[PDB]
Design a protein around this ligand. Structure first.
Ligand code: CA
Ligand code: CA
Ligand code: CA
Ligand code: CA
Lengths: 114, 114
């Protein structure tokens, strides 16, 4: 019974609100153009994107790549994908399957009689 | 100079660190099981998931659905799209009608007359 939300909850609202403010101003609220994408990362992550700032082409490359519709805009789902892609490419991996001892098995029933 | 990083930058580290701590403890660091998924949302979003807590099955349903590999775990990319799905699933709007669940069988004398 807690009336105070965790720090994580606050962050969720902050992320949604921040994108909404920039997005609503320009283009559809649920989509981001190249200008908004660059602006959001530059102001929020100027230190992390210092190298990105030097290469303008590098920055537009990722945005366009993430846009599957080639509509020069990214969907909400597409936007979060971009962040994940930046952190790690995540190459496709395959596994044969799951296996293990299986903890043997339960005992059978004697089914004996008096 | 940049001086200090914005809240958005801090939030990014917080999200990654939080998932990492729970994930590394149980299962692979880059994957989340049902227990971690439920635990992360419950502690961070106990107020938002109050209705979710009541229905345990509803909660496991979302996790399993998001898992395309049916490997009982979600990738980093899969995890972030789960949140997006929760926010908006394009659910149909509710409307008053005589529709309802079907049960038993109709009278033999009666006919479907399609
Ligand atoms: Ca926009
Ligand atoms: Ca698109
Ligand atoms: Ca894990
Ligand atoms: Ca999976």
């Amino acid at each position: 019974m807690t009336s105070k939300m965790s720090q994580l909850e606050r962050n969720i609202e902050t992320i949604i609100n921040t994108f909404h403010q920039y997005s609503v101003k320009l283009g559809h609220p649920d989509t981001l153009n190249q200008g908004e994408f660059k602006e959001l990362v530059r102001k929020d992550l100027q230190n992390f994107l210092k190298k990105e700032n030097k290469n303008e082409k590098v920055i537009e490359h990722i945005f366009e790549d993430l846009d599957t519709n080639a509509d020069k805009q990214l969907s909400f789902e597409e936007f979060i994908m971009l962040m994940a892609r930046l952190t790690w490419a995540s190459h496709e991996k395959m596994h044969e399957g799951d296996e293990g001892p299986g903890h043997h098995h339960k005992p059978g029933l004697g089914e004996g009689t008096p």
